Paper text:
The [name] E3 ubiquitin ligases 1 ([name]) and 2 ([name]) are responsible for the ubiquitin-mediated degradation of key tumour suppressor proteins and are dysregulated in various cancers and diseases. Two members of the NEDD4 family, WW domain-containing E3 ligase 1 ([name]) and 2 ([name]), are of particular interest due to their targeting of the tumour suppressor protein phosphatase and tensin homolog (PTEN) as well as various other tumour suppressors and transcription factors. We evaluate their structure-activity relationship (SAR) by synthesis aided by molecular docking using X-ray crystal structures of [name] and [name] solved as part of this study and improved over those previously reported.
However, we were able to solve and refine structures for the apo-proteins which were improvements on previously published data. The available crystal structures for [name] (PDB ID: 6J1X20) and [name] (PDB ID: 5TJ819) have missing domains and/or high Rfree values. Unfortunately, however, the [name] domain was still disordered and therefore missing from the structure. The grid boxes to perform the docking simulations were generated in cavities on the [name] domain surrounding the active site cysteines 890 ([name]) and 838 ([name]) given the ability of NSC-217913 to interfere with ubiquitination. The ligand poses of compound 11 in both [name]-2L34H and [name]-LH are somewhat similar due to the similarities of the proposed binding site between these two enzymes. These poses show the imidazo[4,5-b]pyrazine moiety engaging in π-π interactions with the phenolic side chain of Tyr639WWP1-2L34H and Tyr587WWP2-LH alongside the Cys640WWP1-2L34H and Cys588WWP2-LH backbone amides participating in hydrogen bonding interactions with the imidazole nitrogen. Against [name]-LH, the butyrate chain has multiple hydrophobic contacts with the aromatic ring of Tyr587 and the alkyl side chain of Ile813, with the backbone amide from Ile813 also undergoing hydrogen bonding with the carbonyl oxygen of the ester. Lastly, the side chain of Ser646, located at the rear of the cavity, forms a halogen bond with one of the heterocyclic chlorides. Interestingly, all compounds modelled against [name]-LH also participate in halogen bonding between Ser646 and the same heterocyclic chloride.
Author numbering: 358 to 395, 482 to 865
The structure:
């Protein structure tokens, strides 16, 4: 479907190298885990404690409880995996996708149908990113910041493909299997009916972020203004202007209209060009696994449910950290790593998601970390004043850590910053 352009061919290759990296990465992928099934009354979650564990068990309980009996057989060939999965899953009634899932890899026997189901989920979760289908693009170099392609309607079946992707992701959650497609935290936020934020723009589009901030920083008029409640987009040529409001072309932007402007424009940047595609994703998801079942999860917990946890090697982490104005030996940095040393693995993941915008770690670990601009190690900067919380720049894998005056000040601030939502 994709027109044979300069970007398309660049993207084609980059995705092919993913395929050459695919085999090795699945051994790494096999070490992802969550929690052993609840051993209670029909896997009852127990009494509510705010933990991720409880939410996991609670959500599994609903899956178990609502699952149709018997089983369903998805029959696919290793080399036509996308097309075969798509045909099978989209000709089933969505309720039948909640029955126990048997993946039959054509001509491959061997048992450990769990093994096989896990591999299929992993491989299918990369296969959907094939540039050929026009569904996705990245915002940075490499595979940085996956987003729906606004020119996806190049593929005339693109909405039905988004529906299948929705079903497949729900089936991952529904059967406790991990995927690796690489959706962003704001994309999870949309699955939770949560409104993405100005801070979130920094993750997906730092340039666009830096300006929206320099609108709200700057007083207006002083240094010009000259804006309407409109924004342009360029979907496959057609420089389509888009009203921020109804009759927006006339609706002219003042200083009085500026916080409204920012809210509408924040909202615009996340939704622009990808509305029908996201709707089709959500409808596919929702017919297999009700989105209402996600109600306890924040976007980071949702990510972790889908991707699975991995153990964080402290040594690798600490080894591949770089500093700005701090050294390794600085007082605040000593306290930082002490707090990290005392965290359990799940809070270590929480901090990783806070600083980098994902729970996922590249195959080499911390030395291989990508920011927007390409390689970018985990970085701690001496920035802020004491009464500030720590802040991150996910674009740069960067934590701004105020020069706090004690371990307990730092500890409480950092724990607070990482546990916050919206
Ligand atoms: Na096969």
């Amino acid at each position: 479907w994709q027109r044979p352009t300069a970007e398309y061919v660049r993207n084609y290759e980059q995705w092919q190298s993913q395929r050459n990296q695919l085999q090795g990465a699945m051994q790494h992928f096999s070490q992802r885990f969550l929690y052993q099934s609840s051993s209670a009354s029909q896997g009852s979650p127990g009494a509510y404690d705010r933990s991720f564990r409880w939410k996991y068990h609670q959500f599994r309980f609903l899956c178990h409880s609502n699952a149709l009996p018997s089983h369903v057989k998805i029959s696919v060939s290793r080399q036509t995996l996308f097309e075969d999965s798509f045909q099978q899953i989209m000709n089933m009634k969505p309720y039948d996708l909640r029955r126990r899932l048997y993946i039959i890899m054509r001509g491959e026997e061997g048992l450990d149908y769990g093994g096989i189901a896990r591999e299929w989920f992993f491989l299918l979760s990369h296969e959907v990113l094939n540039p050929m289908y026009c569904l996705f693009e990245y915002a940075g170099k490499n595979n940085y910041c996956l987003q729906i392609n606004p020119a996806s309607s190049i593929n005339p079946d693109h909405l039905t493909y988004f529906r299948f992707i929705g079903r497949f992701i729900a089936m991952a959650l529904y059967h406790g299997k991990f995927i690796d497609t690489g959706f962003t935290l704001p994309f999870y936020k949309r699955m939770l009916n949560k409104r993405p934020t100005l801070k979130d723009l920094e993750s997906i589009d730092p340039e666009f972020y830096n300006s929206i901030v320099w609108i709200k920083e700057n007083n207006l008029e002083e240094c010009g203004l000259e804006l309407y409640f409109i924004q342009d987009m360029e979907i496959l040529g057609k420089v389509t202007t888009h009203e921020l409001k109804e009759g927006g072309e006339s609706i002219r932007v003042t200083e009085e209209n500026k916080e409204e402007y920012i809210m509408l424009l924040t909202d615009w940047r996340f939704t622009r060009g990808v509305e029908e595609q996201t709707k089709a994703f959500l409808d596919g998801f929702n017919e297999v696994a009700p989105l209402e079942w996600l109600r306890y999860f924040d976007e980071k917990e949702l990510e972790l449910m889908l991707c699975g946890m991995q153990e964080i090697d402290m040594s690798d982490w600490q080894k591949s950290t770089i500093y700005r104005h701090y050294t390794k030996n600085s007082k605040q940095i000593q306290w930082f790593w002490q707090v990290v040393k005392e965290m359990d693995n799940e809070k270590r993941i929480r901090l990783l998601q806070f600083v980098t915008g994902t729970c996922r770690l590249p195959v080499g670990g911390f030395a291989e970390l990508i920011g927007s601009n390409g390689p970018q190690k985990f970085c701690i900067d001496k920035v802020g004043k004491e009464t500030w919380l720590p802040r991150s720049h996910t674009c740069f894998n960067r934590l701004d850590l105020p020069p706090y005056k004690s371990y307990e000040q730092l500890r409480e601030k950092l724990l607070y910053a990482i546990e916050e939502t919206e």
